[PDB]
Amino acid sequence: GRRIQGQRRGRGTSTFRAPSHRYKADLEHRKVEDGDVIAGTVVDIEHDPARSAPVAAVEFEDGDRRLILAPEGVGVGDELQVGVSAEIAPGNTLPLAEIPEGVPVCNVESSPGDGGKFARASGVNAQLLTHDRNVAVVKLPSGEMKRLDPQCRATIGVVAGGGRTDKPFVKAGNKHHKMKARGTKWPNVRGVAMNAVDHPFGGGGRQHPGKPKSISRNAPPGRKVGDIASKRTGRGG
Amino acid sequence: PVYVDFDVPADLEDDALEALEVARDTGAVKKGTNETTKSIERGSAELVFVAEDVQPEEIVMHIPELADEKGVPFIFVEQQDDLGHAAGLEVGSAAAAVTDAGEADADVEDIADKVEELR
Amino acid sequence: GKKSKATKKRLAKLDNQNSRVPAWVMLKTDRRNHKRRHWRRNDTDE
Amino acid sequence: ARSAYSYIRDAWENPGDGQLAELQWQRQQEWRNEGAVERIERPTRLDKARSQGYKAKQGVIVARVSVRKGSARKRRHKAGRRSKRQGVTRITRRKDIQRVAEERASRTFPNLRVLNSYSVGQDGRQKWHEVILIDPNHPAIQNDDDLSWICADDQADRVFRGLTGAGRRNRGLSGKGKGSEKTRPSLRSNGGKA
RNA sequence: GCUUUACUGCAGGCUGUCGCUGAGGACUCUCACUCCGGGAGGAGGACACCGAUAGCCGGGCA
RNA sequence: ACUCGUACGGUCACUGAAUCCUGCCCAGUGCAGGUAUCUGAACACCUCGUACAAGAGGACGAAGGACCUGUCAACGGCGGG
RNA sequence: GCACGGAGGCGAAGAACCAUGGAUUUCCGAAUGAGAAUCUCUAACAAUUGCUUCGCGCAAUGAGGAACCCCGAGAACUGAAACAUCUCAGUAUCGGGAGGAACAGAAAACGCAAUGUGAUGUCGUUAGUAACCGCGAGUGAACGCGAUACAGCCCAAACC
Ligand SMILES: [Cl-]
Ligand SMILES: [Cl-]
Ligand SMILES: [Cl-]
Ligand SMILES: [K+]
Ligand SMILES: [Mg+2]
Ligand SMILES: [Mg+2]
Ligand SMILES: [Mg+2]
Ligand SMILES: [Mg+2]
Ligand SMILES: [Mg+2]
Ligand SMILES: [Mg+2]
Ligand SMILES: [Mg+2]
Ligand SMILES: [Mg+2]
Ligand SMILES: [Mg+2]
Ligand SMILES: [Mg+2]
Ligand SMILES: [Mg+2]
Ligand SMILES: [Mg+2]
Ligand SMILES: [Mg+2]
Ligand SMILES: [Mg+2]
Ligand SMILES: [Mg+2]
Ligand SMILES: [Mg+2]
Ligand SMILES: [Mg+2]
Ligand SMILES: [Mg+2]
Ligand SMILES: [Mg+2]
Ligand SMILES: [Mg+2]
Ligand code: NA
Ligand code: NA
Ligand code: NA
Ligand code: NA
Ligand code: NA
Ligand code: NA
Ligand code: NA
Ligand code: NA
Ligand code: NA
Ligand code: NA
Ligand code: NA
Ligand SMILES: [Sr+2]
Ligand SMILES: [Sr+2]
Ligand SMILES: [Sr+2]
Ligand SMILES: [Sr+2]
Ligand SMILES: [Sr+2]
Ligand SMILES: [Sr+2]
Ligand SMILES: [Sr+2]
Ligand SMILES: [Sr+2]
Ligand SMILES: [Sr+2]
Ligand SMILES: [Sr+2]
């Protein structure tokens, strides 16, 4: 047959690319030698096209002006700190080791110094649970207990823009506008609605997959469609 | 470095090259890794020098053990070009051998002894 | 359109080639410009 | 008596034992960080180099080249093929890696001509060979009784036509009798069946 | 052209084994190699990646 | 490529606004998990064979299968007496 | 000049014409200072190399050529009265490269087994033989022999 849409994606052609030339900045934590003698002032709150959430522009002591992944409750004028000795307040960054247990955090690094990988989406947060000299235990937004190096840096508080998901798009046109700001091909044509040549589910008088949807993990690209390695399906049981 | 099992003091290395310099003006000396090698094999060698800045190391890796199973004493020189200069060459020399000193036997003897001690 | 200096030289040459076979060449050879082109009926290169 | 050279030779008969073993373990760390073709002042295996024609003289160059290990890196058929011509994974190329190495080296030094080459080991993902190249335009060589032959016009780009020792072996030209019915005088003249 | 529990194969995924690969049926370590870090250094570690091969799945493809 | 993205994410599918609802079936097929025992290739190992080799057999046994379990808003099914 | 016009001119200061050698030889073009649909902008071996007086100072490469030649990549229609091994075929086509011819070449050969031959191409033959093969269709040498032409040498190491 013909390659399915999932396969066209990988080629990274314009249709499937993200509007990167329009994206603002990479919100990675600052790199500090040590001492925490790094503080800056929030000079402005901006809209981040890539995340549909707000970001804050900060002017640091040493003259560096950079955008930062802002938690909820940060405003212009406010002073932020980044370092081992940073103060324990919303909007401040410091290694998990310095963070008191039971404190919601965001933009958590996976490997100390990577700039932040976890909990960066609208209104989300990781929950610092356990401390130690060898391992910091964090509860990520998905509910998973993640063991991290206590040297992994993070920002106190939850990500701004929470609740974004609580309101329905209502119109196709609204989805449309959001989609234009992401690396995604939209709208979506169902596999069952295509010709046999275009998808495993295509073909047949009436629409219906002519096979079970739960596909094996070992299936090759082009065939891995539907419910991938489902451990179960439905709502029952 | 892989064939070097002990470090020689700058001062000892100094005396050796001096001895080697008078050895060529008085007695006899071999210049070059090949000639140095045949001397040890023919047993016609009293003291063999081996530079430490030799690349590739294969060129002189054999001198150490070969000398041991031949009783011939050997010493290391930090630089290749010094040994060549001391041997009286306009170029460098990865290894050298004093084939019978000359009015330096006393010194060459001490040098060999100072090494055995240095292990 | 906007013609470059070179394009212009070529266009000019084509215009010149578009002339007739001199009358004397007729007498001399004792009896056509096979490359006669028309701006409308034809199409030049570029 | 034994030449000092024989000791380098003897060391390389078992590159995985003795001092040579530790040298390779050390060196390869540096080699893995070098480029595809690195010129070197002196051969790593002197005995082999001199044996292959090397000389400490102007116009003689040595370069270490690395190539990825394994079989062919081929793309599966996009058009119809019978089971036989659908193979992709176990199909290997007809030129050995040493030959690929000789060619890359010669491309890097367009003016030089490949004289010979030899192996200097490998790790799990690549192989290294050192190639001896000669400057056919340098007088120190135009006047050398043992190398001036490589200055002739018909020796130009010799490696690309399989005129190298590795080239000739790979073309099945070693045997002078049985087995060389389709290799000599050329693979091509024999319909490419060798 | 299309389909599939038609025939025969081919990609691909899973898995064992051999090489890369080191020291002291379960284990410690560091030195290759990998990853994080501007760097110091940190994490991991003879595994993983990669080469070779074996078994299974394999209209994704011929 | 996704991705200047990180689960309030984005990938793969099905249904197709709101409203009231969405029953029964895990035997077969699919997916996933588990698995005492059974089955399960090659290398190495052992026996026989060969002054060697081919080869024959053995022991060990991964995934997989047998077997067990979960799962239908998974393929689908919901009859005759 | 082709080219048989008109006008005019050149040639005994030996023109025309022919051979050999030299002069001139715009721009783009491998195209090489940078750029560009044959032009433009502000001293140029661009790029990769060797040597090196370490300065582009001295040099090399690049692109072309009817096919021939050498090294790589490598189909299908087709035949088998289907078709998968096989065939078509190492063909078509593709990548790289040399020359006037290429390539091969002085035995770790041959094995008419010998008290024998004696580098290598090629031609005739050996022969559709040996060998291969759903042992189907088909594929298919060699040694030798008769010819052509003949030619044999140089390193590495030992010892210096
Ligand atoms: Cl969305
Ligand atoms: Cl060449
Ligand atoms: Cl004979
Ligand atoms: K065929
Ligand atoms: Mg960022
Ligand atoms: Mg878009
Ligand atoms: Mg749809
Ligand atoms: Mg339709
Ligand atoms: Mg239709
Ligand atoms: Mg399909
Ligand atoms: Mg339907
Ligand atoms: Mg006009
Ligand atoms: Mg000579
Ligand atoms: Mg020929
Ligand atoms: Mg990296
Ligand atoms: Mg098909
Ligand atoms: Mg519908
Ligand atoms: Mg509809
Ligand atoms: Mg130009
Ligand atoms: Mg047929
Ligand atoms: Mg064939
Ligand atoms: Mg038949
Ligand atoms: Mg054939
Ligand atoms: Mg024969
Ligand atoms: Na026109
Ligand atoms: Na070259
Ligand atoms: Na063959
Ligand atoms: Na069922
Ligand atoms: Na001219
Ligand atoms: Na040039
Ligand atoms: Na220069
Ligand atoms: Na037929
Ligand atoms: Na047919
Ligand atoms: Na066959
Ligand atoms: Na006869
Ligand atoms: Sr990042
Ligand atoms: Sr970064
Ligand atoms: Sr269908
Ligand atoms: Sr239910
Ligand atoms: Sr030198
Ligand atoms: Sr018109
Ligand atoms: Sr060339
Ligand atoms: Sr509804
Ligand atoms: Sr079931
Ligand atoms: Sr002859």
UniProtKB/Swiss-Prot annotation, chain A:
One of its GO terms (cellular component) is cytosolic large ribosomal subunit. Keywords: Ribonucleoprotein, Ribosomal protein, RNA-binding, rRNA-binding. Part of the 50S ribosomal subunit. Forms a bridge to the 30S subunit in the 70S ribosome. Interacts weakly with protein L37Ae. Transmembrane segments: none annotated. Residues 199-237 are annotated as: Disordered. This is Large ribosomal subunit protein uL2. This protein can be partially incorporated into E.coli polysomes in vivo, indicating it can replace the endogenous protein. The gene is rpl2. Pfam families: Ribosomal_L2, Ribosomal_L2_C.
From Swiss-Prot, chain B:
It comes from the Archaea. GO terms for molecular function: ribonuclease P activity; rRNA binding; structural constituent of ribosome. The keyword tRNA processing applies. The keyword Membrane does not apply. PROSITE patterns: RIBOSOMAL_L7AE. Keywords: Cytoplasm, Ribonucleoprotein, Ribosomal protein, RNA-binding, rRNA-binding, tRNA processing. Its main location: cytoplasm. Gene3D superfamilies: 3.30.1330.30. It is found in: Cytoplasm. Coiled coil: none annotated. Pfam families: Ribosomal_L7Ae. One of its GO terms (cellular component) is ribosome. One of its GO terms (biological process) is ribosome biogenesis. Belongs to the eukaryotic ribosomal protein eL8 family. Multifunctional RNA-binding protein that recognizes the K-turn motif in ribosomal RNA, the RNA component of RNase P, box H/ACA, box C/D and box C'/D' sRNAs. Part of the 50S ribosomal subunit. Interacts with protein L15e. Probably part of the RNase P complex. This is Large ribosomal subunit protein eL8. It comes from Haloarcula marismortui (strain ATCC 43049 / DSM 3752 / JCM 8966 / VKM B-1809) (Halobacterium marismortui).
Swiss-Prot record, chain C:
Binds to the 23S rRNA. Forms part of the polypeptide exit tunnel. The keyword rRNA-binding applies. It holds the Pfam family Ribosomal_L39. InterPro entries: Ribosomal_eL39, Ribosomal_eL39_CS, Ribosomal_eL39_dom_sf. HAMAP family: Ribosomal_eL39. It comes from Haloarcula marismortui (strain ATCC 43049 / DSM 3752 / JCM 8966 / VKM B-1809). The keyword RNA-binding applies. It comes from the Archaea. This is Large ribosomal subunit protein eL39. Part of the 50S ribosomal subunit. Interacts weakly with protein L23. Keywords: Ribonucleoprotein, Ribosomal protein, RNA-binding, rRNA-binding. NCBIfam families: PRK01242.1.
